[PDB]
Amino acid sequence: TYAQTLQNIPETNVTTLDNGLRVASEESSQPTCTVGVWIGAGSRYENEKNNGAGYFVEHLAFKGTKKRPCAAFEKEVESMGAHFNGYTSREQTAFYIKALSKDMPKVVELLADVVQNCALEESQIEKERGVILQELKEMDNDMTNVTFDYLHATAFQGTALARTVEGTTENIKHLTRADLASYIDTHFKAPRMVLAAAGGISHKELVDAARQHFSGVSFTYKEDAVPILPRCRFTGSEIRARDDALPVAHVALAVEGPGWADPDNVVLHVANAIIGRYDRTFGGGKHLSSRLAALAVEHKLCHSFQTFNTSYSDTGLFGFHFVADPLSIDDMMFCAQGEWMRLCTSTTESEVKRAKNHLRSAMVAQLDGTTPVCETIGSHLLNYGRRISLEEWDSRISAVDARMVRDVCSKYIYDKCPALAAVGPIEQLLDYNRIRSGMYWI
Amino acid sequence: GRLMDRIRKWYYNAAGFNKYGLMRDDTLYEDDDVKEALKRLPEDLYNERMFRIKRALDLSLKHRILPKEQWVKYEEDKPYLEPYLKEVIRERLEREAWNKK
Amino acid sequence: YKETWNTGVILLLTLMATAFVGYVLPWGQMSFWGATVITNLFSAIPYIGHTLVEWAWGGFSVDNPTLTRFFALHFLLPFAIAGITIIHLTFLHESGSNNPLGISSDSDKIPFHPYYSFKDILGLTLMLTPFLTLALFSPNLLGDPENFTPANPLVTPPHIKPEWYFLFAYAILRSIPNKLGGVLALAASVLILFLIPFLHKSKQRTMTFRPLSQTLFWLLVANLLILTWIGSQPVEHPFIIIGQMASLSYFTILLILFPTIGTLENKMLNY
Amino acid sequence: MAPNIRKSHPLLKMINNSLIDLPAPSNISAWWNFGSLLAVCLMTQILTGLLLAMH
Amino acid sequence: APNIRKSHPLLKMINNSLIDLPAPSNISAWWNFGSLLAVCLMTQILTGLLLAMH
Amino acid sequence: CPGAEDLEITKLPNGLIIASLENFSPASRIGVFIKAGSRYETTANLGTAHLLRLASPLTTKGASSFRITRGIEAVGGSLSVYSTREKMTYCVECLRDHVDTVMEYLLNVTTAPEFRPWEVTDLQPQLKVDKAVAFQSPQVGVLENLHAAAYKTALANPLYCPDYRIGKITSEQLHHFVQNNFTSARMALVGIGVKHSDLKQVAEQFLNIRSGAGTSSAKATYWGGEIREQNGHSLVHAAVVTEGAAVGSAEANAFSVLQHVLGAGPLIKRGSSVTSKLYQGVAKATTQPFDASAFNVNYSDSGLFGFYTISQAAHAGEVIRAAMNQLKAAAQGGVTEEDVTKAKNQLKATYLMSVETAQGLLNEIGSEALLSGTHTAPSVVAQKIDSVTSADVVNAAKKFVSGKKSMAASGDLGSTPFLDEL
Amino acid sequence: VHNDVTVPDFSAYRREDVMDATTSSQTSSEDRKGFSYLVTATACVATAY
Amino acid sequence: ALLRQAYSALFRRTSTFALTVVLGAVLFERAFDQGADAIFEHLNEGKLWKHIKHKYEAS
Ligand code: HEM
Ligand code: HEM
Ligand code: HEM
Ligand SMILES: CO/N=C(/C(=O)OC)c1ccccc1CO/N=C(/C)c1cccc(C(F)(F)F)c1
């Protein structure tokens, strides 16, 4: 039975190295594994002058360390069949590896070597400079991301969260070997990092290999101190980037979310499951349970739409994004906001009942493999300061009911000034005022 | 015995749409269910219905009817739509019932 | 065609109010007493009764203040009728005309002009002839001689009765001895039209192919001539009992029998 | 705009879509003649009404 | 149609001339007289009738 | 309480294979694997397999189009159909407690479709959409043309309904395709997250379209053509192959390894691939951005092997040549005993990682239970892989340089070479 | 590229309570809405009178 | 904070907002009229019949 399978899930072991680093893992019977370090750093930690540094650092992170230059490093990882990957977001960065459990220790050494000893070769930097500049022109053509960037740019205008992860064209054309070094030396530090691992690995052998390559200890009390970031102010507002030459328009709308720590996030996610998502390839078509999806199909309201509950330490974004043809934007928005009002005023037990099952499946599906189980551990620790087992999540998810979804949603959505980002042939979508009114009375 | 059958056949003739060459199903008021059913009819059945109906409208404007020989006989009336229509309604009631639960 | 229908019911009501206030203007005996009889019915409404009435009269009885406001209303309402008529046709054009066989006519449509412009012009002259014949050869056939006498509040005419087109309703009014009940009955006799769309049970639209409904239909028509006739008669035996029979059958036919027979017919078609 | 001025013009277009190119069933009978008579009847009452009102 | 403000044969009219009706963003107070003229007209008719009744 | 369970695998009298593995995961994933696909299509019914794929949600004899979707979604489940030119998998996922519920729909969809004409008619325009998003990846257009150039039949058949046939498929063709292919001897009912007895009681006391193997696909004749597509794209995608190895064939392992030796996919984000001879070779040849990999497909009665290259138009010439020279250079003993060692690992690793996924595992399991009826232990597949000499690899490479090649390219081919110029 | 785009400064227009970029704007939201809505409700009362 | 209390209790749910307008108007009328009349009479001391009435008021 489900209930039981949840209990019999191996616990996540966490132990702290005296230098401040935390080591966690979930041991499975798998011959293959994933281990990596999740860092509490990102563009939110950057300032107006080093914006993009963490991303620039992501480009070098793999081009070799001091102990072993480019060619050697790659050749050493490739030849053991290991996969080296990672990313960097607004509040979180990560570098992790997929290899056989057998190589777990050599892996840990490689990791530690990357975060601690990045070569930062002067010649390499000038090369990744042109590369990043191109990835900007490429990403500039991905409306979905251009839209979420804009959403942040305005929702959190005038703050750190208002910045893109990749940074500016200026910052990238001028960032220095120093700034990159400074960033790494300023942010990649034990107390702010977590070495997570999942697969067939002994927590012990892990931590042992940990103490060995993650030695650097702290002297002052400052070094053992995790810095609290200045809060980012949310602003109900809109940014309209219009280009009628674009084939379809993208629209994103959101209100301020509570931030990782808050339990309501469980309800918000349940809420998003009720509205859910859609795309012209969903075979379910006109019979989908999601009312917004049905209308979308019946009236050809959009090419796709998604609900999201993006969390951050002290805040977040709760909203939705859709892609529609120039002449259906207005109706889509209309029904969409309509569904939000339904959430606050007339949610049904049948809806939540189903929303919960979808959510349960979603959380489980997020632990499908070593890399994804590792991502969870790295993230949970860094954000909740511990691991929340599916058995717990389920307990919380099961306590949600209609009454609760209504109160929580009313609390975050009803009569709030939203953040709006629109890109493309958006002439038919219009007036912040009109949209603001869609924020009340079902 | 054959009472229900005597009555039906009687009503059928009293109604008189058979004098226009129409099938009982040709005379149905086109509400939503009926409209859906019609969309499911095979092409040939749909065109035959269309001609029959157009033909009846023309007789109607002329204030004539078909010669007695061409009248649809009670037992030869083909209930071509009733099958589709019953299915359309079955589906509707399923969804209605389900959306309440 | 629900909306075309409801606006229609509204047109009828407005037309009746128009003719009612119009009739008072010549200020003859039937003008005054008809005004009195009908308006006094509202003093029967609970609590707000007497108020509503003295408000309508602009005093304590039908008098000059009533006449002047009735003229204003009579001048005005016809324009509302014209207005509403536009809405009537607007809803109508959403669907287009229905037809005598009750089946879709998309397979065979013709332009309004010249077919119907001609048919209608012909229809106009065909009706217009009897109209003029009556108005020119028998001008007072339909009017009450009592209206060739100036209104006198100190002389009640023996038989206070309306123009023919209100008789059916007057009969129903008088069928319920009880000021309040009769008023509701009168009101219901016309408001009943708003329920017709909800009492359709037949699987077919028209009555062209529904012989049981057809007789029920003509029964109802005859029912109306009878009420019209009872409406013109004094309130005495046997007109009293006949009157209630007719009033009762009227409502029964529209409320109970039509929907019932329709269902019954559905079974006889094996539906 | 459009070929014939009966369809383009903001007013004639209205006159055309309700009294000329208006699609009507081919089989409507004399019973459908009463709508137009009602309208004409109404215009006539209003006309004679005004003439009486002036005296 | 999704919202009944656009589908309905009447509300649609009310919507296309008083709600979703596209208006220039820079029209001044001089454009306020059309509506005043309308309201003015409704008012004359109203007070007129009231006087006519006496 | 739960512990180590073992992968059972019965086989009913009608030939219906049932695989099963209880990993006590909070979620289950049952699936119906079938030997069917555009491979069994004839010029007469092209696209029918594709439309069938999109038709999974249509009404069935036991459940309606409406109940199939609402029903599955009510328990947070999912239902999908993945397929290749010769295998179709219908699978559903859900929490352990809902298997029995989700099972009814899976059973119904694969064994009791109704293909009502109207439903089918309204669905067909979807082939146009589905195919439109898929073709957004140039990657997909060339592979279609590759199979069309590499073969004269069966496999030459496209995976996406051809245009001219959209809207012309019939309920008869759908029914006939299903009646002649979805037969118990061609189907396997795999199922992760469940007790074998349960999954078996289902398979028997429930599945009905049965017996035999119905329509047999024509042998895969090899053509060796060259289809080019001038479409302007600043990037040219080209793929040059030769008859490779079949599945279950010993010669397989050899190619799979020559694959990793030549290089098949990067292992380091934004990183250069040194362990990739092919990549490295091309790198020394061109200066601008590009990509190159070892292409390898293994089908029932045939296979394809070669390389695939993406490059700026003007440099496709130099880039494709390079990829070639690097293949010949390998066929001429240009393979270290170490390269063979590295590869063998990357392959075993890649294999082992490609099974952490609920999807990945079920696929692996089901694939065998269908084109075999057994489960080759992981140690065995390992034993088979490293047991590949350095010679085998050099031979595989030879087979390519000598065999008749077929090429498929698309983009601004203005500077792209013809098969006879390599 | 869009990365180079940023929202101009609205300090010349922001209300006093949301002027500071490091303070949550939610804490004063019921205040800002309560005021404007109070004006509105009062107009309704003045009009109803 | 009255503005917040007001918002939460009165202006948030459209139903209570209307209730506030109605109850608000009832109270506004009573108050506004008393004040207006008060102002008007004070500005016209001893000129209104209300003022001189007593001189002849005596049956
Ligand atoms: C001043 C009164 C009225 C005017 C000027 C008027 C005018 C019209 C016109 C011009 C038509 C189209 C032609 C026709 O079918 O006759 C029409 C149709 C119609 N009217 Fe009226 N009408 C009036 C009153 C009413 C009333 C009282 C009702 C119903 C209680 C009504 C119900 C309808 C309906 C339902 C149609 C649809 C006809 C069809 O079946 O095709 N009308 N009316
Ligand atoms: C909807 C159309 C109208 C109807 C049904 C109608 C009906 C009547 C009726 C029944 C009378 C009494 C007739 C009598 O027996 O003497 C009347 C009188 C009168 N109507 Fe109308 N009327 C209509 C429109 C108008 C209009 C538009 C006006 C002028 C603005 C008008 C002006 C008068 C006047 C002045 C009288 C008094 C003179 C007289 O009694 O002949 N009527 N009307
Ligand atoms: C276009 C709107 C109207 C205009 C411009 C208008 C203008 C006037 C004017 C200039 C007067 C003279 C006022 C005076 O000095 O005593 C007047 C009087 C009058 N109007 Fe109107 N009027 C309008 C509409 C109406 C309507 C619709 C009615 C009623 C159906 C009406 C009924 C009267 C009456 C009864 C008087 C006479 C009493 C009086 O003089 O105060 N008016 N109107
Ligand atoms: C002012 O009176 N006009 C009469 C008349 O014949 O005008 C043509 C009249 C004459 C004698 C008795 C009753 C009436 C009043 O009308 N009688 C009835 C019974 C009636 C019935 C229903 C509705 C209405 C109304 F109000 F018009 F809406 C009135």
UniProtKB/TrEMBL annotation, chain A:
Domain Peptidase M16 N-terminal: 22-168
GO CC terms in record: mitochondrial inner membrane; protein-containing complex
Cellular compartments annotated: Mitochondrion inner membrane
Domain Peptidase M16 C-terminal: from-to ranges: 175-358
Major place of residence: mitochondrion
Superkingdom as given in the UniProt entry: Eukaryota
GO molecular function list: metal ion binding
Name of a matching Pfam family: Peptidase_M16
Assembly with partners or alone: Component of the ubiquinol-cytochrome c oxidoreductase (cytochrome b-c1 complex, complex III, CIII), a multisubunit enzyme composed of 11 subunits. The complex is composed of 3 respiratory subunits cytochrome b, cytochrome c1 and Rieske protein UQCRFS1, 2 core protein subunits UQCRC1/QCR1 and UQCRC2/QCR2, and 6 low-molecular weight protein subunits UQCRH/QCR6, UQCRB/QCR7, UQCRQ/QCR8, UQCR10/QCR9, UQCR11/QCR10 and subunit 9, the cleavage product of Rieske protein UQCRFS1.
SUPFAM superfamilies noted in UniProt: LuxS/MPP-like metallohydrolase
Protein name per Swiss-Prot or TrEMBL: Cytochrome b-c1 complex subunit 1, mitochondrial
Stretches assigned to coiled coil: none
Keyword terms, alphabetized: Acetylation, Electron transport, Membrane, Mitochondrion, Mitochondrion inner membrane, Phosphoprotein, Respiratory chain, Transit peptide, Transport
Membrane topology listed for this record: Peripheral membrane protein
Similarity comment text for this entry: Belongs to the peptidase M16 family. UQCRC1/QCR1 subfamily.
Species, as recorded: Gallus gallus
From TrEMBL, chain B:
Record flagged with keyword Mitochondrion: yes
GO CC terms, sorted: mitochondrial inner membrane; respiratory chain complex III
Topology class, membrane: Peripheral membrane protein
Pfam families recorded: UCR_14kD (PF02271)
Keywords linked to the UniProt accession: Electron transport, Membrane, Mitochondrion, Mitochondrion inner membrane, Respiratory chain, Transport
GO biological process, one term: mitochondrial electron transport, ubiquinol to cytochrome c
Compartment annotation: Mitochondrion inner membrane
Gene3D superfamilies: Cytochrome b-c1 complex subunit 7 (1.10.1090.10)
Function noted in UniProt: Component of the ubiquinol-cytochrome c oxidoreductase, a multisubunit transmembrane complex that is part of the mitochondrial electron transport chain which drives oxidative phosphorylation.
Similarity remark: Belongs to the UQCRB/QCR7 family.
Protein name, as recorded: Cytochrome b-c1 complex subunit 7
UniProtKB/TrEMBL annotation, chain F:
Domain Peptidase M16 C-terminal: from-to ranges: 168-347
UniProt keyword terms in alphabetical order: Acetylation, Electron transport, Membrane, Mitochondrion, Mitochondrion inner membrane, Respiratory chain, Transit peptide, Transport
Gene Ontology cellular-component annotations: mitochondrial inner membrane; respiratory chain complex III
Gene3D superfamilies per the UniProt record, alphabetical: Metalloenzyme, LuxS/M16 peptidase-like
Subcellular location: Mitochondrion inner membrane
One of the record's GO molecular function terms: metal ion binding
Pfam families associated with the record: Peptidase_M16, Peptidase_M16_C
Segments forming domain Peptidase M16 N-terminal: 19-163
Main location as per UniProt: mitochondrion
Family matches, as InterPro entries: Metalloenz_LuxS/M16, MPP/UQCRC_Complex, Pept_M16_N, Peptidase_M16_C
Membrane topology value: Peripheral membrane protein
PANTHER family: CYTOCHROME B-C1 COMPLEX SUBUNIT 2, MITOCHONDRIAL (PTHR11851:SF226), METALLOPROTEASE (PTHR11851)
Family listed: Belongs to the peptidase M16 family. UQCRC2/QCR2 subfamily.
UniProt subunit comment: Component of the ubiquinol-cytochrome c oxidoreductase (cytochrome b-c1 complex, complex III, CIII), a multisubunit enzyme composed of 11 subunits. The complex is composed of 3 respiratory subunits cytochrome b, cytochrome c1 and Rieske protein UQCRFS1, 2 core protein subunits UQCRC1/QCR1 and UQCRC2/QCR2, and 6 low-molecular weight protein subunits UQCRH/QCR6, UQCRB/QCR7, UQCRQ/QCR8, UQCR10/QCR9, UQCR11/QCR10 and subunit 9, the cleavage product of Rieske protein UQCRFS1.
Protein name: Cytochrome b-c1 complex subunit 2, mitochondrial
Annotated source species: Gallus gallus (Chicken)
Automatic annotation (TrEMBL), chain H:
GO biological process terms, semicolon-separated: mitochondrial electron transport, ubiquinol to cytochrome c
Keyword NADP part of the UniProt annotation: no
Lineage: Eukaryota, Metazoa, Chordata, Craniata, Vertebrata
Subunit note: Component of the ubiquinol-cytochrome c oxidoreductase (cytochrome b-c1 complex, complex III, CIII), a multisubunit enzyme composed of 11 subunits. The complex is composed of 3 respiratory subunits cytochrome b, cytochrome c1 and Rieske protein UQCRFS1, 2 core protein subunits UQCRC1/QCR1 and UQCRC2/QCR2, and 6 low-molecular weight protein subunits UQCRH/QCR6, UQCRB/QCR7, UQCRQ/QCR8, UQCR10/QCR9, UQCR11/QCR10 and subunit 9, the cleavage product of Rieske protein UQCRFS1. Component of the ubiquinol-cytochrome c oxidoreductase (cytochrome b-c1 complex, complex III, CIII), a multisubunit enzyme composed of 3 respiratory subunits cytochrome b, cytochrome c1 and Rieske protein, 2 core protein subunits, and additional low-molecular weight protein subunits.
Family per similarity comment: Belongs to the UQCR10/QCR9 family.
Topology versus the membrane: Single-pass membrane protein
Subcellular location: Mitochondrion inner membrane
Organism: Gallus gallus (Chicken)
Alphabetically ordered keywords of this record: Electron transport, Membrane, Mitochondrion, Mitochondrion inner membrane, Respiratory chain, Transmembrane, Transmembrane helix, Transport
Keyword Amino-acid biosynthesis part of the UniProt annotation: no
PANTHER family for the chain: CYTOCHROME B-C1 COMPLEX SUBUNIT 9, UBIQUINOL-CYTOCHROME C REDUCTASE COMPLEX, SUBUNIT X
Subcellular location, principal: mitochondrion
Pfam families, per database record: UCR_UQCRX_QCR9
